[model samples]
Target: SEIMNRTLDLQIIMDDLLNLLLKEFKLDLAVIRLVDEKGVLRVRSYSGKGIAGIAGKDWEPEIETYIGEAFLSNRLQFVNDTQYMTKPLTRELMQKEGIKSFAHIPISRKGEPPFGILSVFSRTIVGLFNEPFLNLLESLAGQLAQAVKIV
Candidate 1:
């Protein structure tokens, strides 16, 4: 019935979640990248202002990058400023995309290894990532895990 069409709507669910956070937090961009069987990260859903052209994207979870650090360590990684990013790709993207600040939260549930990373970005300076906000992100990420579970 309608199950086949709607059951494969994980990206829709992810997009809704991203949009809510972006709107509530006054964010410029938000992206969710999930790991695949090859262990590569692929952008699954995204929401934000003046964003979406690069909806289909890919990156590795290598330790050298901030996203990778969050994914590997299952921790929150935030930078008040993006100008000083060391990685070449992020550094360039930071400038090209006018990204000024960002926070990365790894997605996992039930103590399992993280399968993705959720990133929140801002173009202007902001002081929003406090403990409560961080907790909310983890809880939401866990909710995503339910939708992201492998078939």
Candidate 2:
């Protein structure tokens, strides 16, 4: 059933969703981090600009940044200023990227702990996450979780 369910192509689905989000939302950056079986946050996909070496970097969800906070709390976190955050991580990297605002939403599957995060960043001070953006992210998360479950 896994093959029939198309779990074999989850990465393609992720890429498609990322492309769609990039076109529709036009955010500065978008990244998806998924917890590996070892429970470390690993960036699986990314889009937009100024994000490098993010994908494959092993990060702890409890360590730093709004994404870490969201991952640990399994809640949505919206931060206007990532540089001044008390628990922010990758400040140097963020600064290099010129990111000003960002949001992180947790993606949990069934009863499992949140194993993935959907994040978006902006180079400006404005909040890019409105109702439509949030809705798309939620829908993408659901699709990703279902794909993961099948795999």
Candidate 3:
């Protein structure tokens, strides 16, 4: 019953976030993950072409990976090229997905051990994450942290 409640909560929150991001910013893909007890970032929810397969996958907190570093540091990171950024850690995946650019925003609750991360990707250069986009993502990351707590 508890697991069911958490799953439903995650689904509802992710659906709402997906809709909001798509409608407002023309974003097509999103991935949300939280640090687990093992100190790994595990995918909880995601949207986009290959997002379905990423759920439940776990990765270590490595500065080499954009989201991993963001979670470790609890800061927003911008990468113009996933290929160049992730290096060997994500080279295969990035090439497979045809990802050109991406960004990471931390969604950790204050004083929490495991930090959550909001990773978004685009096929084209997203030269739009200016001041407005940053503010929007900051707000969304807060909501996402709540979603993780419900889980």
What count of clashes does model 2 give? Answer: 0
Q: Rate the local accuracy (lDDT) of all candidates.
A: 0.78, 0.73, 0.71
Candidate 2 lDDT over 34-72, as tens digits, reads 888788888777778755544225578774556788888
lDDT, ranked from best to worst = 1, 2, 3
**Which residue ranges in model 2 land beyond 4 Å of their true spot?**
1-8, 53-56, 81-96, 110-112
User: Model 3 scores what on Cα lDDT?
Assistant: 0.71
lDDT winner between 1 and 2, please give it: 1
TM-score, predicted candidate 3 vs. hidden true structure: 0.77
Where does candidate 2 clash, by residue pair?
none
Tens-digit lDDT string for candidate 1 (1-151) = 4666564687678888988887787677888888988999888788876445432357788778778899999887987677766777756866687777788888888788999988888876656677888788888888987787743
> RMSD, each candidate, Å?
2.9, 3.3, 3.2
Model 3: residues >4 Å from true position, as ranges? Answer: 52-57, 81-96, 110-114
The TM-scores of all predictions, comma-separated, are: 0.82, 0.77, 0.77
Best by TM-score: 1
Error of 1 at 148 (Å): 1.2
Q: What shift in Å separates residue 8 of candidate 1 from its native position after superposition?
A: 2.7
As for lDDT, the candidate ahead, 2 or 3, is: 2
TM-score pick, better of 1 and 2: 1
